[PDB]
Amino acid sequence: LTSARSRIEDSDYATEVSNMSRAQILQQAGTSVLAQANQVPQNVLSLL
Amino acid sequence: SLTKQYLSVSNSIDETVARYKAQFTQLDTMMSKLNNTSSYLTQQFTAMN
Numbered sequence: 001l002t003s004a005r006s007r008i009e010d011s012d013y014a015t016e017v018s019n020m021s022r023a024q025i026l027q028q029a030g031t032s033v034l035a036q037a038n039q040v041p042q043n044v045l046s047l048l
Numbered sequence: 049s050l051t052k053q054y055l056s057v058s059n060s061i062d063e064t065v066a067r068y069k070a071q072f073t074q075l076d077t078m079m080s081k082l083n084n085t086s087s088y089l090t091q092q093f094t095a096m097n
Binding site: 014021 | 085089096
């Protein structure tokens with residue numbers, strides 16, 4: 001019964017760490033892209 | 049009478065030792081897997097450094 005329960009409860013260490021690394025990468029890329037996106041059109045318009 | 053009594057208790061002891069043995073084996077396997085996990089975790093987190 002211990003094994004059976006563990007087959008339901010336990011998350012996988014490797015899978016979760018992989019997911020975390022991936023999500024961190026996505027988050028950094030997203031913030032960078034957002035900064036870029038905000039910043040260019042405003043100044044292009046500004047100079048016009 | 050003492051002989052038969054001794055036989056009984058010795059058989060009981062044999063049983064109990066056998067009972068302990070299987071728990072030992074299970075502990076061994078689970079420990080192996082847990083050590084593998086721990087090594088992986090330390091490695092990966094040291095990498096994320």
